[PDB]
Amino acid sequence: NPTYFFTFGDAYSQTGFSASGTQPSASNPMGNPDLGIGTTTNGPNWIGYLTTTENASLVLSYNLAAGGATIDNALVPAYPGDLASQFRLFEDVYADKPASAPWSAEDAVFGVWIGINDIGNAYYSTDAETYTPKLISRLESLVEEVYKNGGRKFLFLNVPPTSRSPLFLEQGEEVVKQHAEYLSVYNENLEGMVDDFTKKKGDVTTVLYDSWSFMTKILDDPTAYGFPDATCINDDGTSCIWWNNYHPGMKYHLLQAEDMKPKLRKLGGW
């Protein structure tokens, strides 16, 4: 009795899963590519860890996340595979519960980690208080498409402190601050939307995972987590928090998946 874990997001979540590649099964829960390929971590990412390491029962991962994605290119644009396009791929291939993914309300979990790129691209050019409600409203309307398909279990990750990635640190402390302040408003509005959606529907099980606070704890005390500092980069994915200037490594992702596990029990696969 599997949990069907459909995920949507950006490079913090990408694995290179193709809808025409090998599909998930009990012997191969990621489907494609192999566990530990296709990420920005040098190994598994949080989804691979949640599916194969932190799972309490069989989890099948259908990971539609794409590098560089924003929520909708009609708002903050970047790459063709925005969140809207990932929801369209879901609608095209899995929404109708095909034999390859015969999911139901009781066994499907929809995970969304989006906003890093919307904020990264719009923090200095838009007003957070008036603009981030538009981003969040568009996220909500995409979630509503899955709800209309019969989805009832949802996992939302807030935006982590990319303000303190080496990429942003190099732009100066006032840019880190401008970005961080915008990000905080986005995360507040995300929480409000998740709360409002949960209450309005009444029949959904939702988890808002505060990645921001978790990563912030590690950035503030890196050596307590086995990292020598909060700024070094190492593409082995484990010597430093950062695998490259803007993406954390597999060690961070494992620590996050481990932190997530207890909070995901109510979703069925953990």
From TrEMBL:
Entry keyword Hydrolase: yes
Top-level taxon in the UniProt lineage: Eukaryota
One term of GO molecular function: hydrolase activity, acting on ester bonds
Alphabetized InterPro entries for the sequence: GDSL, GDSL_Est/Lipase, SGNH_hydro_sf
Record keywords, A-Z: Hydrolase, Signal
Pfam families cross-referenced by the UniProt entry: Lipase_GDSL
The protein's name: Cellulose-binding GDSL lipase/acylhydrolase
Annotated source species: Aspergillus niger
